[PDB]
Amino acid sequence: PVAHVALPVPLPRTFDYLLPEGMTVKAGCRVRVPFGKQQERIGIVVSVSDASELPLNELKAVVEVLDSEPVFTHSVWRLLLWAADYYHHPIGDVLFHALPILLRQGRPAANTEQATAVGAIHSAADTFSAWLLAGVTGSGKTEVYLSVLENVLAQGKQALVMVPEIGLTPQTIARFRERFNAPVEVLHSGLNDSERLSAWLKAKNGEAAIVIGTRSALFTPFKNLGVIVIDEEHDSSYKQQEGWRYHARDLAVYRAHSEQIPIILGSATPALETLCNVQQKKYRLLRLTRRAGNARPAIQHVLDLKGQKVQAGLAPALITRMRQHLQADNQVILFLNRRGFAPALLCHDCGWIAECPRCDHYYTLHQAQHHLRCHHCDSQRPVPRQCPSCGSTHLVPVGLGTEQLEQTLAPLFPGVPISRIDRDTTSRKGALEQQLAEVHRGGARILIGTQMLAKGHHFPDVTLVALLDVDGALFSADFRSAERFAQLYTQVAGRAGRAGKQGEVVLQTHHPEHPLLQTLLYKGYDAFAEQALAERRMMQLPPWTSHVIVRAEDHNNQHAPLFLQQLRNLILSSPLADEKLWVLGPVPALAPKRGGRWRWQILLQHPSRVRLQHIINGTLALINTIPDSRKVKWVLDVDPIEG
Amino acid sequence: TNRLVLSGTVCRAPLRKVSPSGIPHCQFVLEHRSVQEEAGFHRQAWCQMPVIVSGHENQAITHSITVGSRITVQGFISCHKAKLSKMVLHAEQIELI
Amino acid sequence: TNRLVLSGTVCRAPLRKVSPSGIPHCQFVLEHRSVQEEAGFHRQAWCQMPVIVSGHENQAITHSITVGSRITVQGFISCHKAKNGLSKMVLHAEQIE
DNA sequence: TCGGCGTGCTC
DNA sequence: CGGATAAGGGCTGAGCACGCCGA
DNA sequence: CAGACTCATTTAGCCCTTATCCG
Ligand SMILES: [Zn+2]
Ligand SMILES: [Zn+2]
């Protein structure tokens, strides 16, 4: 017979090979098969048939069959096929991305509310029931997770736990190991190849009970899967943006649906699409707001910035409040989503500003290292002494950064230690721990940091949270920027105060009368989420429609526009396409130049995702008629999180 | 001590008017482009200077100041508020080339 | 040729906002009061031309300015840039008493 | 006379 | 002291025989 | 006082290079 073999090649076609007599294969079995006259690569058998497009005598033979048993389970294989068809990616790459690295070369396969929620989850058993846990930060999400996991393990099944970042794995595996006598295992890119293969084998055998990992742990087969748990589903780490661009949450929901197992999504700030599904009765919500253990909510204040004597970006009222809080032996934390000393260097004579030729972006100034660094291509440049245009020597730093803030708050506070944490100062694993060790010592301290302050780290001695330079989320072209800013603000403000001490939050902005800020400050995140969801319902947005963006990169900004215009013409000239389909013309992306190559995009909008998928499949089948398809890098991104 | 020497080309058109007191007045804007020294490093200097000469007899040069490779004006300088001409020049000595 | 000679008192306290890689700068405003006389009538000279001192060579003389003192600053005239066009006209001091 | 760059295909 | 292993980086997440053009 | 919507943080290939542990 003839066996269809998929190979790690960016082509949406499965090659056909002839099996010599005496050898049989099944679906999803690795086969060592020659490919040309270069090397005998490793492929995966998709299906076996009797007829081929080419003559049977023309086909080649297979050297050896690595495995007599499919590496993927039936559910995993079905999910892989469905994802490959849905994301319009070549099947071979999709299949090989879900395999361990060692197996790719053919190596031997070898409270009252909490109780009610737990009872409801237990009652809804042996059925595909998707649940969403929403509550204030600091609630008993981990307690509910432990309860549902022990209830599932009572039947002897397994469990899967997903976290957005690697750094959060120890803080939860410690609790899981303490509570549960059953073995647990981790699986992420941080581990070595042998450890990942051992985790894969243990999950397949079924000896391991709980598998904890990032989005790459979703493809691990399980002997008997009982429940899938997703923590912090709104994080952007679940969406891959390189190679195969899938979303972990959607694939996990599909896996739960196919296997008919409960799935629990927990997040303090649920995503807009999750809330839309909740409104659409697709999900079931559970609100566990219990004051996070009799903890008083923080006090929110808005301070006008116009017409104020700002000292290093701080208002006098903010300075007085910080001094008052520090006098009471309590730490203070300041949020500034910037890096370096100055975001740009400006000439005082002619207005010249240093700009990266490869990015069309202003260089960022670092004073400790004394150089100009680009934050988009990591280019290294020295600090200029004279302006290249006019020759003046009056270059002045402009803008505010964390390094400048740390430098300039030293004179204001005489005996208050200053601690700064960001990506620049956290290049070493031990560096993070010692800086967190200093914070845990208590006393008085000022913390300056980027959004790294919103991670799993919890500071029990901080009472005041101040946000600086929050502008940019109110005048952005992106429609998702407000949601992201609200999620970040809720995460940062949720850490203010403690059970005993009352927290205070101060926001500095030039537009205190903006409806967004007022709604987010004087009302909870849920009210803003509902208002934004209704507003998007009034418009046509991805929470209520389907968006597919075809990005194209050009080395000389010449072939991408014409290629995208031809693609748009093919999209419009198709019987599958209807009037309701909305396709935007070729326009530059939010970043017209990122790595020396221009970027252009096409946005496709349709109320139904299945119709859009059919249209895209037809167009992809019709791509071969488009000339000059080479020398242009283009990808398809389904449901983008940016742009 | 208040004096200025400046060399530059003319800009726009040289307006010539007669004051009610009988002293002719000429107003024009000078374009300057030169390189000077600043902290030991050479850099270019440029500015636009309106010149309002109020001479009577020695201002005969103004008849041929519309075209000139090098126009040099020397004398007193003083500026003033304008509630958009803030920096003005009203020297008397004018030299060509 | 761009050279300006001026004398007067100081209006605003000097500022010492330093620049990256050294090369400090001095920011202060000069106040000048004098009179001008010629054939026919007399003129008045008064405004607030700013003066800029750059480089570490002249740093030792920028001291003891305080708020008001009779000083003479020599140098050329150059313009600046801002959101309101020229928006000012500073003086690049070369020789200081 | 010889190296650098733009195409199909591999079952 | 040699083998095996852990940590870090730099472009790339398909590539080679073939034919054409400039040096 | 001098730029506007941003920025900034995150996980996951691949071959080549460098430094470290163990028998
Ligand atoms: Zn300049
Ligand atoms: Zn760059």
Residue numbers in the entry:
A (entry chain H): 2 to 111, 200 to 732
B (entry chain A): 2 to 84, 87 to 100
C (entry chain B): 2 to 98
Quote the study on this structure:
PriA, which is the only replication restart factor found in all bacteria, acts as a “first responder” protein, recognizing abandoned DNA replication forks in a structure-specific manner and recruiting other factors needed for replication re-initiation. PriA is a 3′−5′ DNA helicase that comprises six domains: a 3′ binding domain (3′BD), a winged-helix domain (WH), two helicase domains (HD1 and HD2), a cysteine-rich region (CRR), and a C-terminal domain (CTD). PriB, which is a homodimeric paralog of ssDNA-binding protein (SSB), stimulates the DNA unwinding activity of PriA and forms a stable complex with PriA bound to replication forks that have ssDNA lagging strands. Binding of PriA to a replication fork triggers PriB docking, with PriB binding ~100-fold tighter to the PriA/replication fork complex than to PriA alone.
